[PDB]
Scaffold this motif. Structure first.
Motif, mmCIF file in Angstrom:
data_model
loop_
_atom_site.group_PDB
_atom_site.id
_atom_site.type_symbol
_atom_site.label_atom_id
_atom_site.label_comp_id
_atom_site.label_asym_id
_atom_site.label_seq_id
_atom_site.Cartn_x
_atom_site.Cartn_y
_atom_site.Cartn_z
ATOM 1 N N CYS A 1 0.460 -1.596 -3.225
ATOM 2 C CA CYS A 1 0.234 -2.989 -3.579
ATOM 3 C C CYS A 1 1.350 -3.859 -3.027
ATOM 4 O O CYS A 1 2.509 -3.447 -2.965
ATOM 5 N N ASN B 1 -2.113 2.772 -5.051
ATOM 6 C CA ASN B 1 -3.518 2.600 -5.383
ATOM 7 C C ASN B 1 -4.359 3.418 -4.417
ATOM 8 O O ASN B 1 -4.009 3.554 -3.243
ATOM 9 N N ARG C 1 -8.078 -5.102 -4.817
ATOM 10 C CA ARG C 1 -7.395 -5.695 -5.957
ATOM 11 C C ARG C 1 -6.515 -4.628 -6.584
ATOM 12 O O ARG C 1 -6.933 -3.477 -6.703
ATOM 13 N N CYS C 2 -5.308 -5.012 -6.987
ATOM 14 C CA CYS C 2 -4.386 -4.035 -7.547
ATOM 15 C C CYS C 2 -4.881 -3.514 -8.886
ATOM 16 O O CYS C 2 -5.625 -4.181 -9.608
ATOM 17 N N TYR D 1 -2.724 -8.806 -7.875
ATOM 18 C CA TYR D 1 -2.513 -9.106 -6.467
ATOM 19 C C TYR D 1 -3.650 -8.544 -5.622
ATOM 20 O O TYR D 1 -4.366 -7.625 -6.024
ATOM 21 N N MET E 1 -2.575 -5.311 0.215
ATOM 22 C CA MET E 1 -2.182 -3.912 0.200
ATOM 23 C C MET E 1 -1.620 -3.540 1.563
ATOM 24 O O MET E 1 -2.019 -4.104 2.584
#
Ligand SMILES: [Zn+2]
Ligand SMILES: [Zn+2]
Lengths: 361, 98, 88, 178, 46, 49
Positions: E7, E14, E23-24, E29, E32
């Protein structure tokens, strides 16, 4: 195939600047040189839609073009991404094909436009309540619903369901408790992050307890936001009610919201009986709210234990000793006429048949 | 942003259809707010100029207006109806970096 | 994006797919030479299953470069955006 | 195998051709059982209790009857209205009796999680918990439309005989169980 | 086995391995970055 | 329609946002009010140093 050696190992390759097709086994060149447009003409490119280039967009009836313009306006006033509008108009045109809809009244086509936007929005996982779209139109809910069912049956297209988490994320930001507006005391302002966490775990609890199936989700989400909002500060917020919060939030709560609240109180009582401290403290409907975090910290095992004592509608949970009693067999028809006296009632004698013409006149 | 926008809105305060008199629409007040981004769920979050630089987005803030108009009755009011969006100059009054 | 296609002889990716990671994008820190692919993009032919065609992002340049970082992001309408930084 | 609960039929639909012209106004004038509200609709609707049924008659000489719990009961009621019309002074006949539809219902006595059914059966199952509380499933063999609810009770319609209802019931039962 | 993207804000690993939109998992956030390569690279100290 | 319409239903939002972003990005300013077409108003910022 290479014309010189017949092998099929042709490889496309370019030297420093020369593009060519070379047999990688004998070095022969079978085709060389390309002709490509440059920037001087790249600056002049225009566009013509192929439908226009094929004579289409000319058979569009005044009503059809008006309808697709309505589609564009509806899609754009909501500030949706352009691909949504393009897909919406494509579906509208495709559905216009059948004779059964092109022959239809204006409100039918209006609600068809609405449900077309709605389905294309569904296809993108985007959450959107049908009530809002009905609000953006000149139609009533019932006719819209009936026509939506009719069109989905006709086309049989895929209709992804509404994911509850997405509704929660869309709905939570709508409320106005995250800002110190002068119309609301600062006592009620809270961080929205903890708000969302508490609410989404509360609605997960509601979902796995069979509360949400077959019912409107919106009142359940409202009730969950309630339990959160009281849970983050029971010191003062426990004294408020449904009407108060919806007044400050400027929201029209649904009528079934109170009933949904009551049943989820039944559930959290069933959930609190398991815990030692709660089951000893002898809590009640109102006092339980302050331990919500404690219960949801250990939700899963406790709710699994509570399942072994499920949830079913209270109306049929009244302990029906008899379930679907077998009716008596009465399929017998007699030989030809079980009776003739039944026909001896179905006719009027002339005494009152004569005067059968001078009260309705 | 601070004054000229309001002056223009005042210069164009009232609109009325020539057909069917007694119907009209009046603007009252117009604001510019703070920059934000429209993600894919009809919700918004605030941004920073570098995030816009990276994501090929536009750094802008919504234009919002309160309105007064009639439909059968004249007592219809809206307070925060948006019109559009305005790009924001960096280190201006409404920017994040000020 | 398709993963690198392995060689029928060497259990290893073909030369044009030398630097690609297992997902079809280059791995930061590698050295990229001329004519090697950066992203193994494939596009459908709609313009019964739909056929694809390959339009990979080949590195064009006279001198080798090093991949410093790769950034992946998306927009509202599901348009995945990929950016890469190269260093000499 | 069977769960011990049989699908009970709730309704029967049948029609027969009377084979003659009739005057609805005459029927409303003579019969001790009749409507004629041409301002709303120009027709006459019957009903009797043995069998428990409702029938509807036109000037065109057709009969539509419904309400019985068995097809033979529906035919009995049809012949009763035929007798009534014959003694009404019309030369009615009981010709071309046809059975149109019936409705049945049953239960499984365990809760139904509609979400899994729609997630594994969306291609024929339509789930929409906003307007219609239950789940809608259309079955091909035979041409049956099915309504399913959380309580476990199921409503079946679209058949022509009780055998179709039973067979559709046992077709769906393994799906309902898991 | 699934691939890891870092992230851009909290730097928590992730895994996506799907068309799931970016999306984190912890923060909100939406940017990436790929991890560094595992193969070694040889440089001339000149 | 005999029933009175409400203007909120038609309040569009594209024709301002797109107008502003286009006018700034492409750099040309076309105004029918004064029949003025201006070009080269905006330039890309330079980051050579
Ligand atoms: Zn050759
Ligand atoms: Zn993060």
């Amino acid at each position: 195939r290479c014309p010189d050696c017949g092998s099929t190992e042709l490889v496309e390759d370019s030297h420093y600047s020369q593009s060519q097709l070379v047999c990688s086994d004998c070095g022969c060149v079978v085709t060389e040189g390309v002709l490509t447009t440059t920037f001087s003409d790249e600056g002049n490119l225009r566009e013509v839609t192929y439908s226009r280039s094929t004579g289409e967009n000319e058979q569009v009836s005044r009503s059809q073009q008006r309808g697709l313009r309505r589609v564009r306006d509806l899609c754009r006033v909501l500030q949706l991404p352009p691909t949504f509008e393009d897909t919406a108009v494509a579906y509208y045109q495709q559905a216009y094909r059948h004779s059964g809809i092109r022959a239809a009244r204006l409100q039918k086509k209006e609600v068809l436009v609405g449900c077309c936007v709605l389905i294309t929005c569904r296809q993108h996982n985007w959450p959107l309540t049908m009530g809002a779209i009905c609000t953006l139109l000149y139609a009533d809910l019932d006719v819209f619903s009936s026509t939506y069912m009719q069109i989905v049956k006709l086309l049989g297209l895929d209709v992804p369901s509404l994911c509850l988490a997405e509704l929660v994320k869309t709905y939570c930001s709508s409320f106005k408790l995250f800002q110190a507006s002068p119309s609301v005391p600062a006592k009620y302002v809270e961080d929205k992050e903890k708000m969302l966490s508490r609410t989404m775990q509360l609605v997960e609890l509601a979902n796995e307890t069979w509360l949400v199936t077959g019912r409107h989700p919106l009142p359940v989400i409202t009730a969950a936001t309630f339990l959160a909002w009281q849970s983050l500060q029971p010191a003062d917020r426990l004294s408020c009610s449904l009407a108060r919060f919806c007044k400050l939030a400027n929201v029209d709560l649904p009528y079934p919201a109170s009933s949904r609240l009551q049943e989820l109180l039944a559930v959290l009582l069933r959930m609190a009986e398991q815990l030692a401290w709660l089951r000893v403290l002898r809590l009640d409907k109102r006092s339980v709210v302050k331990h919500i975090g404690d219960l949801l910290q250990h939700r899963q095992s406790l709710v699994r234990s509570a399942f072994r004592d499920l949830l079913l509608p209270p109306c049929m949970l009244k302990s029906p000793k008899r379930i679907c009693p077998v009716p008596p067999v009465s399929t017998v028809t007699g030989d030809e006429n079980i009776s003739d006296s039944e026909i001896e009632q179905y006719l009027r004698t002339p005494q009152e048949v004569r005067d059968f013409q001078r009260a309705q006149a | 942003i601070n004054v000229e926008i309001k002056k223009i809105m005042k210069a164009n305060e009232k609109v009325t259809s020539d057909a069917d008199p007694m119907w009209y629409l009046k603007y009252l007040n117009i604001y510019v707010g703070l920059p934000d981004v429209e993600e894919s769920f009809n919700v918004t979050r605030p941004v920073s100029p570098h995030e816009c630089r990276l994501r090929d987005m536009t750094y802008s803030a919504p234009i919002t207006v309160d309105i007064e108009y009639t439909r059968g009755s004249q007592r219809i009011i809206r307070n925060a109806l948006p019109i559009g969006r305005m790009p924001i100059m960096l280190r201006s009054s409404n920017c994040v970096l000020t | 994006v398709m993963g690198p296609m392995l060689d029928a002889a060497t259990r290893k990716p073909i030369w044009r797919h030398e630097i690609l990671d297992a997902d079809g994008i280059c791995s930061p820190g590698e050295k990229v030479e001329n004519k090697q692919v950066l992203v193994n993009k494939s596009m459908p032919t709609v313009t019964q299953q739909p056929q694809y065609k390959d339009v990979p992002i080949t590195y064009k340049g006279a001198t080798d470069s090093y991949i410093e970082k790769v950034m992946i992001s998306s927009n509202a309408e599901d348009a995945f955006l990929i950016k890469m930084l190269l260093r000499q | 195998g069977p769960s011990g609960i049989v699908p009970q039929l709730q309704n029967i639909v049948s029609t027969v051709n009377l084979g003659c012209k009739l005057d609805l106004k005459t029927i409303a004038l003579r019969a001790r059982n009749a409507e004629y509200n041409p301002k709303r609709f120009a027709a006459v609707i019957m009903r009797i209790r043995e069998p428990r049924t409702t029938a509807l008659i036109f000037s065109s000489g057709k009969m539509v009857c419904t309400g019985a719990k068995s097809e033979e009961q529906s035919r009995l009621a049809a012949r009763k209205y035929a007798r009534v019309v014959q003694k009404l002074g019309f030369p009615a006949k009981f010709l071309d009796f046809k059975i149109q539809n019936m409705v049945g219902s049953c239960d499984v006595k365990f809760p139904i999680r509609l979400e899994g059914l729609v997630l594994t059966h969306q291609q024929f199952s339509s789930y929409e918990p906003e307007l219609f509380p239950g789940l809608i499933y259309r079955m091909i063999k035979p041409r049956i439309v099915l309504l399913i609810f959380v309580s476990g009770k199921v409503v079946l319609t679209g058949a022509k005989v009780r055998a179709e209802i039973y067979e559709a019931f046992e077709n769906i039962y393994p799906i309902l169980k898991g | 086995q699934p691939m890891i993207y870092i992230c851009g804000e909290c730097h928590t690993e992730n895994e996506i391995k799907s068309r799931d939109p970016i999306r984190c998992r912890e923060c909100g956030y939406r940017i990436m970055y790929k991890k560094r390569t595992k193969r070694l690279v040889v440089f001339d100290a000149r | 329609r005999a029933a009175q319409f409400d203007v909120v239903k038609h309040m569009r939002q594209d024709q301002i946002t797109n107008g502003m972003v286009n006018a700034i990005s492409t750099g040309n300013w076309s105004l029918k009010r004064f029949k003025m077409d201006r070009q080269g108003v905006t330039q890309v910022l330079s980051r050579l140093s």
